[PDB]
Short mmCIF file of N, CA and C in Angstrom, two decimals:
data_model
loop_
_atom_site.label_atom_id
_atom_site.label_comp_id
_atom_site.label_asym_id
_atom_site.label_seq_id
_atom_site.Cartn_x
_atom_site.Cartn_y
_atom_site.Cartn_z
N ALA A 1 0.92 12.86 -2.21
CA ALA A 1 1.97 12.91 -3.27
C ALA A 1 1.44 12.24 -4.54
N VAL A 2 0.67 11.19 -4.40
CA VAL A 2 0.12 10.50 -5.60
C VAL A 2 -1.27 9.95 -5.28
N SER A 3 -2.12 9.87 -6.26
CA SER A 3 -3.50 9.35 -6.01
C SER A 3 -3.61 7.92 -6.53
N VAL A 4 -4.20 7.04 -5.77
CA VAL A 4 -4.34 5.63 -6.22
C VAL A 4 -5.82 5.27 -6.32
N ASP A 5 -6.20 4.52 -7.32
CA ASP A 5 -7.63 4.14 -7.46
C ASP A 5 -7.80 2.65 -7.17
N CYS A 6 -8.39 2.31 -6.05
CA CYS A 6 -8.58 0.88 -5.71
C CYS A 6 -10.02 0.67 -5.22
N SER A 7 -10.97 1.26 -5.89
CA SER A 7 -12.40 1.13 -5.49
C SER A 7 -12.72 -0.34 -5.20
N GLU A 8 -12.50 -0.76 -3.99
CA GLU A 8 -12.79 -2.17 -3.62
C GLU A 8 -11.76 -3.10 -4.26
N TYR A 9 -10.52 -2.98 -3.86
CA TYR A 9 -9.47 -3.86 -4.45
C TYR A 9 -8.68 -4.55 -3.32
N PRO A 10 -9.37 -5.34 -2.54
CA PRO A 10 -8.76 -6.08 -1.42
C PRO A 10 -7.99 -7.30 -1.94
N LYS A 11 -6.69 -7.25 -1.90
CA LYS A 11 -5.89 -8.41 -2.39
C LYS A 11 -4.65 -8.58 -1.51
N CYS A 12 -4.79 -9.27 -0.41
CA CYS A 12 -3.62 -9.47 0.49
C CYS A 12 -2.95 -10.81 0.16
N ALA A 13 -2.91 -11.17 -1.09
CA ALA A 13 -2.28 -12.46 -1.47
C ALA A 13 -1.22 -12.22 -2.56
N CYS A 14 -0.81 -10.99 -2.73
CA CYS A 14 0.22 -10.70 -3.77
C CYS A 14 1.60 -11.06 -3.24
N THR A 15 2.48 -11.50 -4.09
CA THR A 15 3.85 -11.87 -3.63
C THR A 15 4.80 -11.91 -4.83
N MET A 16 5.14 -10.77 -5.37
CA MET A 16 6.07 -10.76 -6.54
C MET A 16 6.70 -9.38 -6.69
N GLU A 17 5.92 -8.40 -7.05
CA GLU A 17 6.47 -7.03 -7.23
C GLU A 17 6.96 -6.49 -5.88
N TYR A 18 8.25 -6.40 -5.70
CA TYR A 18 8.78 -5.87 -4.41
C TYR A 18 8.94 -4.35 -4.51
N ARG A 19 8.28 -3.63 -3.65
CA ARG A 19 8.38 -2.15 -3.68
C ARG A 19 8.17 -1.61 -2.26
N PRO A 20 9.24 -1.19 -1.63
CA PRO A 20 9.19 -0.66 -0.26
C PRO A 20 8.67 0.78 -0.28
N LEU A 21 7.39 0.96 -0.08
CA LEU A 21 6.81 2.34 -0.09
C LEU A 21 6.66 2.84 1.34
N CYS A 22 6.84 4.11 1.57
CA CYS A 22 6.65 4.63 2.95
C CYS A 22 5.17 4.98 3.09
N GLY A 23 4.39 4.09 3.64
CA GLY A 23 2.94 4.35 3.76
C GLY A 23 2.63 5.21 4.98
N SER A 24 1.62 6.04 4.86
CA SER A 24 1.23 6.91 6.01
C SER A 24 0.93 6.06 7.24
N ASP A 25 0.94 4.76 7.11
CA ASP A 25 0.67 3.90 8.29
C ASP A 25 1.92 3.84 9.18
N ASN A 26 2.92 4.63 8.87
CA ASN A 26 4.16 4.64 9.71
C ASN A 26 5.07 3.46 9.37
N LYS A 27 4.93 2.86 8.22
CA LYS A 27 5.84 1.72 7.91
C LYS A 27 6.01 1.59 6.41
N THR A 28 6.85 0.70 5.98
CA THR A 28 7.05 0.53 4.52
C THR A 28 6.04 -0.50 3.99
N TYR A 29 5.83 -0.54 2.70
CA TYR A 29 4.84 -1.51 2.14
C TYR A 29 5.56 -2.49 1.21
N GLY A 30 5.00 -3.65 1.01
CA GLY A 30 5.65 -4.65 0.12
C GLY A 30 5.27 -4.35 -1.33
N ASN A 31 4.23 -3.60 -1.55
CA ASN A 31 3.81 -3.27 -2.94
C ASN A 31 2.45 -2.57 -2.93
N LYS A 32 2.06 -2.00 -4.03
CA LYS A 32 0.75 -1.30 -4.09
C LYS A 32 -0.38 -2.29 -3.80
N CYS A 33 -0.11 -3.56 -3.93
CA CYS A 33 -1.17 -4.56 -3.64
C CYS A 33 -1.39 -4.60 -2.12
N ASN A 34 -0.35 -4.39 -1.37
CA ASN A 34 -0.47 -4.38 0.11
C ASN A 34 -0.97 -3.00 0.54
N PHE A 35 -0.81 -2.03 -0.31
CA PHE A 35 -1.26 -0.65 0.02
C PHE A 35 -2.78 -0.57 -0.12
N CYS A 36 -3.32 -1.16 -1.15
CA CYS A 36 -4.79 -1.12 -1.35
C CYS A 36 -5.44 -2.14 -0.41
N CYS A 37 -4.68 -3.09 0.06
CA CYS A 37 -5.26 -4.11 0.98
C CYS A 37 -5.31 -3.55 2.40
N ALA A 38 -4.26 -2.91 2.82
CA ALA A 38 -4.25 -2.32 4.19
C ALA A 38 -5.30 -1.21 4.24
N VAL A 39 -5.57 -0.60 3.12
CA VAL A 39 -6.59 0.49 3.08
C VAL A 39 -7.98 -0.13 3.23
N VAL A 40 -8.17 -1.31 2.71
CA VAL A 40 -9.50 -1.97 2.83
C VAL A 40 -9.76 -2.31 4.30
N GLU A 41 -8.73 -2.53 5.07
CA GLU A 41 -8.94 -2.87 6.51
C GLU A 41 -8.74 -1.61 7.36
N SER A 42 -8.25 -0.55 6.77
CA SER A 42 -8.03 0.70 7.55
C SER A 42 -9.28 1.58 7.45
N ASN A 43 -10.21 1.22 6.61
CA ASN A 43 -11.45 2.04 6.47
C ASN A 43 -11.13 3.30 5.66
N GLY A 44 -10.13 3.25 4.83
CA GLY A 44 -9.77 4.44 4.02
C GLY A 44 -9.00 5.44 4.89
N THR A 45 -8.50 4.99 6.01
CA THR A 45 -7.74 5.91 6.90
C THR A 45 -6.24 5.65 6.75
N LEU A 46 -5.86 4.99 5.69
CA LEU A 46 -4.42 4.70 5.47
C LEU A 46 -4.00 5.28 4.11
N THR A 47 -2.76 5.66 3.96
CA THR A 47 -2.34 6.25 2.66
C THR A 47 -0.86 5.98 2.38
N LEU A 48 -0.27 6.83 1.57
CA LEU A 48 1.16 6.70 1.18
C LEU A 48 1.94 7.85 1.82
N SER A 49 3.25 7.83 1.74
CA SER A 49 4.05 8.93 2.35
C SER A 49 5.19 9.30 1.41
N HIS A 50 5.92 8.33 0.92
CA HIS A 50 7.05 8.64 -0.01
C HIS A 50 7.76 7.33 -0.38
N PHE A 51 7.57 6.89 -1.60
CA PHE A 51 8.22 5.62 -2.05
C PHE A 51 9.64 5.53 -1.49
N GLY A 52 9.91 4.51 -0.72
CA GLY A 52 11.27 4.35 -0.13
C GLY A 52 11.14 4.10 1.38
N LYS A 53 12.03 3.33 1.94
CA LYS A 53 11.95 3.05 3.41
C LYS A 53 11.62 4.34 4.15
N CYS A 54 10.62 4.32 4.99
CA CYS A 54 10.27 5.56 5.73
C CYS A 54 11.54 6.12 6.39
#
């Protein structure tokens, strides 16, 4: 649905912008900072699904 550019953007210490995204990981996300962080540990096998509680 949307393309994100995080060429090496591991940041699992964000805590401010609240945004419940439906990530392809089968769950919601706390923000795009947690989306690019889970992707750094997913090996690029994680994505988005539809902004909003899955």
